[PDB]
Structure formats: C-alpha cells, structure tokens
C-alpha cells in the first residue's frame, strides 16, 4: 500500500530548470558557431582579419596572402 | 596599351592647349605606367611648396 505519491521539486528559476536547459545546451553551441561564422564572414574584408586569422588557416590560408607588385602601387 | 599610347598623344599634342586637371600622377600607376615612370614624370616638374621660414 502506497500512502503518498513519490516526487521532488527540481530547482528552477524564471521558469527554467536544469533538465530543460541541458537539452538546449547543444543548440546554443550551434547558434554560437552560426554567429561566429557569420561575424567572421562579415569582417573577412578587414585586413587585420586576414593578417591575424584567415591567412593562418592551413592549406586554405594562402587565399588571403596577396601582395600588390611594387610597380603597381602608387602608395 | 592603347591607353598608354593615348597618354603620349595627350602629353605631346593636346597638353599644349588643354589641361587634364582631374588626373593626378598616382592615377596613371598600374593603368598606363609603373610607379617609377609616374614618379619620374612628377619629379621633372616644379610645384608650389609651403612658404619658407621668412614666409
Ligand atoms: C544567430 C541568431 C541567434 C538566434 C538564437 C536563438 C536562441 C534561442 C534558444 C532558446 O529559445 O532556448 C529555450 C530554452 C528553454 O526552453 P523552453 O523553456 O522555451 O522550452 O532556453 C534556455 O534554455 C535558457
């Protein structure tokens, strides 16, 4: 015979609890990647982005190593 | 190559009467001339400097 139902209250805040949030942790990850890729793509033209990030990527990085010949540069 | 030849016609014929005031020497560079050729054209001319120390 059962006298009482068996349960606990899980900690919660602003209507979030850890079981639920834990399911969304990976989604925040992917959105973070999406925002990272997007941001980097937006500033791909900035010379510092190329110098410090993009030209350092292996294989692919040579796409961003481009020199103007000294004969063709007024400045 | 036609642009470069056309500059030479400008310089030897038209420039006696006609100005080309919107064009700077740097504009020729990498279009018709190398940096060195264009610098040489510029360096042959005299331009007004800032006044000296006695003004
Ligand atoms: C680049 C563009 C960015 C768009 C980003 C959208 C991120 C939204 C994530 C989100 O809504 O999480 C909900 C989750 C809680 O789940 P529930 O209580 O809504 O079921 O909320 C929490 O876990 C906190």
List the structure tokens of A45: 């033209």
% helix, strand, coil for chain B, step of 5: 50, 5, 45
Query: With a 6 A CB cut-off, is A35 part of the ligand 1 pocket?
Result: yes
Comparing CB atoms, the residue among B25, B27, B35 nearest residue A73 is: B35
Residue holding tokens 């349960």? A7
Bridge partners (DSSP) of residue A14 are none
Chain A neighbors of B25, CB-CB under 8 A: 74
| Dist CA A65 CA B54 (whole Å) | 50
Chain A stretch 41-70, residues whose beta carbon is closer than 8 A to a beta carbon of chain B: 70
Experimental method: cryo-EM
List the structure tokens of B25: 């020497």
CA distances from A66 to A24, A46, A72 (A): 42, 14, 13
CA distances from B12 to A17, A18, B7, B17 (A): 84, 83, 9, 11
Give the resolution to one decimal, in Å.
2.3
Query: With a 6 A CB cut-off, is A34 part of the ligand 1 pocket?
Result: yes
């Amino acid at each position: 015979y059962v006298k009482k139902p068996s349960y606990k209250i899980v900690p919660h805040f602003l209507g979030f609890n850890i079981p639920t949030v834990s399911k969304w942790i990976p989604i925040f990850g992917i959105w973070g990647a999406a925002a990272g890729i997007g941001a980097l793509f937006l500033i791909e033209g900035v010379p510092r982005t190329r110098q410090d990030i993009l030209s350092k990527i292996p294989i692919i990085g040579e796409h961003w190593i481009r020199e103007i010949p000294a004969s063709d540069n007024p400045f | 190559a036609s642009l470069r030849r056309g500059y030479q016609v400008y310089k030897e014929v038209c420039a006696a009467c006609h100005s080309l005031d919107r064009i700077a020497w740097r504009n020729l560079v990498g279009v018709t001339h190398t940096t060195d050729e264009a610098k040489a054209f510029a360096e042959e001319l005299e331009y007004d400097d800032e006044p000296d120390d006695e003004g």
